Amino acid sequence: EEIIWESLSVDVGSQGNPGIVEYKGVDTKTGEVLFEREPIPIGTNNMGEFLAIVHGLRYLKERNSRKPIYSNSQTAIKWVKDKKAKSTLVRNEETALIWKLVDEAEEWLNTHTYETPILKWQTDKWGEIKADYG
DNA sequence: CGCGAACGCG
DNA sequence: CGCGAACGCG
Ligand SMILES: [Mg+2]
């Protein structure tokens, strides 16, 4: 399998797991930051990766782009394809925001179609994903 | 740590 | 028994 350079790559910046979650989507070729989510006070890395892919799908759909999305998270890719985020994170006041976003992302997936291929970034083959926070 | 995948009680 | 409940990464 070869890299598709005309694509969007996403990744999460965590401060702990669970912990603060942010994410962004970048042009795989140029590194241009296409969208970002400001720090969510608490969530899991998996939840953040799920949100990042869905944000990417919504971004690409709005722009009518056929570019694929790369994620390094096999778990998040499965959740998006299942249209179900199987997170174990407790639902309380503290986690209310991350769960609101996850629930809304699920709702989006269950009420829309999309053409974007969702591909696994292979770090062992290709190095860091372009959206890595470093 | 959180994920998916791989014992004990009825 | 046997059906659920309870390691390997990144
Ligand atoms: Mg990540």
Short mmCIF file of C-alpha atoms (C1' of nucleotides) and ligand atoms in Angstrom, two decimals:
data_model
loop_
_atom_site.label_atom_id
_atom_site.label_comp_id
_atom_site.label_asym_id
_atom_site.label_seq_id
_atom_site.Cartn_x
_atom_site.Cartn_y
_atom_site.Cartn_z
CA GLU A 1 0.00 0.00 0.00
CA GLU A 2 1.24 3.47 -0.93
CA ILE A 3 0.66 6.90 0.59
CA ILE A 4 -2.05 9.04 -0.98
CA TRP A 5 -0.51 12.51 -0.67
CA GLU A 6 -3.69 14.28 -1.78
CA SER A 7 -5.38 13.55 1.52
CA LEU A 8 -6.21 14.91 4.97
CA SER A 9 -4.51 13.56 8.11
CA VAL A 10 -5.87 13.89 11.68
CA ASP A 11 -4.42 13.36 15.14
CA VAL A 12 -5.06 14.19 18.77
CA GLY A 13 -2.94 16.13 21.20
CA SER A 14 -3.51 14.73 24.68
CA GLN A 15 -2.48 15.95 28.10
CA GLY A 16 -3.06 12.63 29.81
CA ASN A 17 -5.44 9.74 29.03
CA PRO A 18 -8.05 10.58 30.12
CA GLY A 19 -7.08 14.22 30.09
CA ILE A 20 -7.30 17.36 28.00
CA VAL A 21 -8.06 16.53 24.36
CA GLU A 22 -7.43 18.64 21.29
CA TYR A 23 -7.20 17.66 17.64
CA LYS A 24 -6.49 18.94 14.18
CA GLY A 25 -6.71 18.02 10.54
CA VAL A 26 -3.90 18.90 8.13
CA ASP A 27 -3.16 18.62 4.44
CA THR A 28 -1.01 15.46 4.22
CA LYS A 29 1.10 16.97 1.45
CA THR A 30 1.54 20.60 2.53
CA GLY A 31 0.95 20.46 6.27
CA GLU A 32 -1.57 23.28 6.08
CA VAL A 33 -3.80 23.13 9.14
CA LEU A 34 -7.35 22.83 7.78
CA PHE A 35 -9.29 22.64 11.04
CA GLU A 36 -8.58 22.50 14.78
CA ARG A 37 -10.55 21.84 17.94
CA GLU A 38 -9.49 23.81 21.00
CA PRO A 39 -8.71 21.88 24.19
CA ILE A 40 -11.62 19.91 25.65
CA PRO A 41 -11.03 19.79 29.40
CA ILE A 42 -11.38 16.00 29.72
CA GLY A 43 -11.78 13.06 27.38
CA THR A 44 -10.03 9.92 26.22
CA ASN A 45 -7.55 9.86 23.37
CA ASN A 46 -9.85 7.44 21.51
CA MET A 47 -12.79 9.83 21.83
CA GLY A 48 -10.65 12.61 20.46
CA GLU A 49 -9.52 10.49 17.51
CA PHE A 50 -13.17 9.63 16.78
CA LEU A 51 -14.15 13.34 16.86
CA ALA A 52 -11.21 14.22 14.63
CA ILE A 53 -12.23 11.79 11.88
CA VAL A 54 -15.88 12.90 12.00
CA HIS A 55 -14.84 16.56 11.87
CA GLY A 56 -12.77 15.65 8.82
CA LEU A 57 -15.73 13.94 7.17
CA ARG A 58 -17.92 16.99 7.75
CA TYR A 59 -15.18 19.33 6.51
CA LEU A 60 -14.59 17.34 3.32
CA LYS A 61 -18.30 16.89 2.67
CA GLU A 62 -18.92 20.66 2.97
CA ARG A 63 -16.18 21.33 0.43
CA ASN A 64 -17.28 18.49 -1.86
CA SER A 65 -13.79 16.99 -1.68
CA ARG A 66 -13.02 13.40 -2.62
CA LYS A 67 -9.77 13.31 -0.62
CA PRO A 68 -9.33 10.42 1.83
CA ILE A 69 -8.69 10.85 5.56
CA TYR A 70 -5.77 9.21 7.35
CA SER A 71 -5.94 8.38 11.05
CA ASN A 72 -3.40 6.46 13.13
CA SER A 73 -6.16 5.15 15.39
CA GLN A 74 -7.48 1.74 14.42
CA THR A 75 -9.98 2.02 17.27
CA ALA A 76 -11.41 5.36 16.10
CA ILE A 77 -11.60 4.14 12.51
CA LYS A 78 -13.65 1.16 13.68
CA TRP A 79 -15.93 3.37 15.76
CA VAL A 80 -16.60 5.66 12.79
CA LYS A 81 -17.29 2.74 10.46
CA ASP A 82 -19.57 1.15 13.08
CA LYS A 83 -21.24 4.54 13.61
CA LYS A 84 -20.83 3.81 17.32
CA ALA A 85 -18.20 5.16 19.74
CA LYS A 86 -17.66 2.33 22.22
CA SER A 87 -16.10 4.46 24.96
CA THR A 88 -16.14 3.40 28.62
CA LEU A 89 -15.57 6.94 29.92
CA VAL A 90 -17.93 7.80 32.77
CA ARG A 91 -20.70 10.24 31.94
CA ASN A 92 -20.65 13.02 34.54
CA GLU A 93 -20.52 16.82 34.75
CA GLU A 94 -16.76 16.74 34.19
CA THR A 95 -17.05 14.65 31.00
CA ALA A 96 -20.25 16.32 29.78
CA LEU A 97 -18.53 18.23 26.95
CA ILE A 98 -16.60 15.36 25.39
CA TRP A 99 -19.72 13.20 25.56
CA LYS A 100 -21.87 15.93 23.99
CA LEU A 101 -19.43 16.11 21.09
CA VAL A 102 -19.22 12.32 20.75
CA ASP A 103 -22.99 11.96 20.86
CA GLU A 104 -23.35 14.68 18.21
CA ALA A 105 -20.70 13.06 16.00
CA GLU A 106 -22.57 9.75 16.22
CA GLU A 107 -25.78 11.55 15.36
CA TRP A 108 -24.06 13.07 12.33
CA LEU A 109 -22.84 9.67 11.13
CA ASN A 110 -26.30 8.13 11.55
CA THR A 111 -27.99 10.91 9.54
CA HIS A 112 -25.52 11.45 6.69
CA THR A 113 -23.75 9.60 3.92
CA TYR A 114 -20.19 10.35 2.82
CA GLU A 115 -17.76 9.31 0.09
CA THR A 116 -14.49 9.88 1.96
CA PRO A 117 -12.28 6.79 2.26
CA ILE A 118 -11.03 6.44 5.85
CA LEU A 119 -7.54 4.96 5.80
CA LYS A 120 -5.13 3.74 8.46
CA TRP A 121 -1.89 5.71 8.62
CA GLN A 122 0.98 3.25 8.90
CA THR A 123 3.53 4.89 11.16
CA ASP A 124 5.87 1.87 11.01
CA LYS A 125 6.07 2.32 7.24
CA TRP A 126 5.67 6.05 6.70
CA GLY A 127 6.87 7.85 9.83
CA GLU A 128 4.86 10.34 11.91
CA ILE A 129 1.35 11.25 10.81
CA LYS A 130 1.43 14.83 9.46
CA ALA A 131 -1.02 16.04 12.11
CA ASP A 132 1.16 14.79 15.01
CA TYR A 133 1.44 17.27 17.88
CA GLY A 134 5.02 16.21 18.59
"C1'" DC B 1 -4.50 4.95 31.12
"C1'" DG B 2 -8.29 3.18 27.06
"C1'" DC B 3 -9.23 0.40 23.63
"C1'" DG B 4 -10.17 -4.40 20.61
"C1'" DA B 5 -9.13 -8.96 20.61
"C1'" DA B 6 -8.26 -12.94 22.69
"C1'" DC B 7 -13.63 -17.16 34.86
"C1'" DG B 8 -17.48 -18.73 37.55
"C1'" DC B 9 -22.28 -19.44 38.03
"C1'" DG B 10 -26.34 -21.23 36.61
"C1'" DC C 1 -20.03 -28.47 30.37
"C1'" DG C 2 -21.36 -23.14 28.29
"C1'" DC C 3 -22.64 -18.41 27.78
"C1'" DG C 4 -21.84 -14.42 29.26
"C1'" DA C 5 -18.65 -11.52 32.56
"C1'" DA C 6 -14.21 -10.61 33.73
"C1'" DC C 7 -2.56 -9.11 26.09
"C1'" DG C 8 -0.73 -5.87 23.00
"C1'" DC C 9 -0.32 -1.94 22.10
"C1'" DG C 10 -0.39 3.49 21.46
MG MG D 1 -3.16 9.94 18.28
#
